[PDB]
Each structure stands twice: as structure tokens, then as C-alpha cells.
């Protein structure tokens, strides 16, 4: 089993194409990965050598993303709430995804454990 | 404007679900972003500063990913060819995507320029 993982929560309600959604998830993964690299170096390295497991789940609102981000901050988890200015097709400042981790899988689940796969 | 970008080339012939595609694209983006961070810090920082633009394009064969990887290596561009072990849904060692960049957009296109958006 993978002891470490990064879960990216994506807003399915925005109905982004498979491609643009993938790009948004990537923004989240990269940003949160570097957050971990800087603030939780050991978690990052362990995750990386293990195969940097990632799981993509979904939610249907920005409200849900903000709530989950607050939970992640409370736990001290590396995370990244994404807003893409290059995404002019949606309102400015619109949040697209929330990446949680890398971190020990159990702690990431403490946040996203009740979310469904996308 | 975006002077830098990262292009993630995904195999459309694998017919990956929306969620697994995003996960694979993320693996590529993260691995390639760290390659840039370590080997082309300046390109990484500019990219990150501009909003780390990412574009997901496609190819219809496994050979195309390797041909593109060779070109990216020849040009000294940060890149990452992904093979997801955890993705036991497909043959072991099957390549899913190739992330190219971050780097100046024109040089990234020198590799992926003729590929269609996914
Ligand atoms: Zn090579
Ligand atoms: Zn160009």
C-alpha cells in the first residue's frame, strides 16, 4: 500500500473539458507539491520515491473547496487552492481545485476521506 | 502574457477516464516542474511567476511519446515520461504522458508544436 498520497479535489460543477480539468488538477498538484517540498520536505521525498501517488476526487462548489482548505490548514497539511486567470471562460477569481498533500495517506483522508472519485 | 509554459502530452489511445487522465497529467507536470526547478531554476521561477501555464495536448500512439521525449532531451528541456505502476489497469510500464517544460514557449513548441489540444 502507498503510505503517502496527494489528493486533488476538483469542481465538477464547472464542467471543464477533460483537458482543461487535467491542467487545473496539475496546477494544484505542482503548487501543493512545492509547498510540501519547502515546509514538509521529508513527506515530499517519501511520497516522491514511493511513486508520488495522486487521487482525483470531486465536489460541486467553491464553498466545498474553501471548507476543505480550512480543514487542511488546520491540520498543517501542504495544500494549494487554485485560481487560474488564464481561464477567461469562467468568472475572475473562480477556484477550480484544491490539492491536499503530499502527506501520510491517513492525514490526507482526514480531509478528503469522504469525497468521491472524479 | 505567457512567455513560459509546460505542455503535457497525453495518449488519447489509452482512453483513460477523466480522473485517471488528470492524475497522470499531474504526475508529468510535477516531475517535470521539479526537473526545471533543479536544472533550469530560472525557467521554473519565470513560469511559476506567470501563473505556471499548462496545456494538455495529445498523441494517438506510444511511439509518439518517446519520439517527443528524445527531442525534448536533445533541446535540454525539463521533461518527464510517465509510467504509472499503481495504474495496474494497463500493462506494466505503459507510458501515459510526457510533460515538456516549463521553458520558453517557443522552445516547448519546437517539440510539441504540431500536436492537437486534448
Ligand atoms: Zn532519453
Ligand atoms: Zn509557440
UniProtKB/Swiss-Prot annotation, chains A, B:
This is Peptidyl-tRNA hydrolase. Its main location: cytoplasm. InterPro entries: Pep_tRNA_hydro_II_dom_sf (IPR023476), Pept_tRNA_hydro_arch (IPR034759), PTH2 (IPR002833). It catalyses: an N-acyl-L-alpha-aminoacyl-tRNA + H2O = an N-acyl-L-amino acid + a tRNA + H(+). Pfam families: PTH2. GO terms for molecular function: peptidyl-tRNA hydrolase activity. It is found in: Cytoplasm.
Amino acid at each position: 500500500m502507498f503510505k503517502y498520497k496527494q489528493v486533488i479535489v476538483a469542481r465538477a460543477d464547472l464542467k471543464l473539458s477533460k483537458g482543461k480539468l487535467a491542467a487545473q488538477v496539475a496546477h494544484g498538484a505542482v503548487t501543493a507539491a512545492f509547498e510540501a517540498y519547502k515546509k514538509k520536505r521529508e513527506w515530499f521525498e517519501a511520497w516522491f520515491r514511493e511513486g508520488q501517488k495522486k487521487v482525483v476526487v470531486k465536489v460541486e462548489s467553491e464553498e466545498e473547496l474553501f471548507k476543505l482548505k480550512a480543514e487542511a490548514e488546520k491540520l498543517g497539511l501542504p495544500n494549494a487552492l487554485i485560481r487560474d486567470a488564464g481561464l477567461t471562460e469562467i468568472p475572475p477569481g473562480t477556484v477550480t481545485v484544491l490539492a491536499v498533500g503530499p502527506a501520510p495517506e491517513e492525514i490526507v483522508d482526514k480531509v478528503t476521506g469522504n469525497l468521491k472519485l472524479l
